[PDB]
């Protein structure tokens, strides 16, 4: 559908921001686990990958339709801890706040596009 | 990635954390006679550089080495 193509980029950006938000909050929650590595995703490359499948064929009514079913990069440690935990509070707190801001911005842009498509139709 | 202000202030926070860590490690080892190898502990210092990504305009703080 053409409607999907217009809203594909913002939807994928919003979903990627939510996933990275979950990853950052997991990094915050597991700050005290000894031996836990701080993981993160490269937002731009994954957004390229998602932006850049074959529903199985249903011959009749009984035939069952096809059933549907990111890469994590390690953060470079800054300070060496003794328990092997590489999670840094300041870095991930700033990243968490930034991801929240960008999620809000994506919501704003997507809502503006939908509202414009709506006022085009209203009449 | 980060917004410019976010990057600058977060770099400032990380640099201050590194300086505080160096100070705490020095204060802990104030009375140490030997290390793990047989050499005295040497007080560490942290050097702040300005991470001027553009030409001389602005930039946060980075730490080259201890």
């Amino acid at each position: 559908d053409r409607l999907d193509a217009a809203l594909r980029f913002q939807q994928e950006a919003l979903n990627l921001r939510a996933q990275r938000q979950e990853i950052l909050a997991a990094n915050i929650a597991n700050a005290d686990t000894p031996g836990y590595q701080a993981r993160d995703i490269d937002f731009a490359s994954e957004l390229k990958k998602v932006m850049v499948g074959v529903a199985l064929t249903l011959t009749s009514s009984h035939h069952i339709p096809a059933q549907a079913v990111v890469d994590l990069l390690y953060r470079v440690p800054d300070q060496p801890s003794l328990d092997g935990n590489t999670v840094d509070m300041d870095r991930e707190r700033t990243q968490f706040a930034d991801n929240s801001l960008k999620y809000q911005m994506g919501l704003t842009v997507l809502g503006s596009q939908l509202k414009g498509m709506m006022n085009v139709l209203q009449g | 990635a980060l917004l410019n202000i976010f990057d600058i202030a977060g770099s400032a926070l990380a640099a201050q954390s590194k300086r505080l860590n160096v100070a705490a490690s020095n204060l802990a080892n104030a009375d140490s006679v030997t290390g793990p190898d047989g050499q005295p502990y040497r007080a560490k210092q942290v050097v702040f550089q300005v991470d001027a990504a553009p030409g001389q305009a602005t930039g946060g703080v980075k730490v080259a080495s201890v």
Partner: peptide, 21 residues
């Protein structure tokens, strides 16, 4: 390289021995 970058490799374990091995 820079502290806070992204790499595809986990950091080596953080060992701190008390005596030289």
């Amino acid at each position: 390289g820079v502290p806070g970058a992204l790499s595809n490799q986990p950091a080596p374990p953080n060992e701190a021995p008390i005596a030289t091995p």
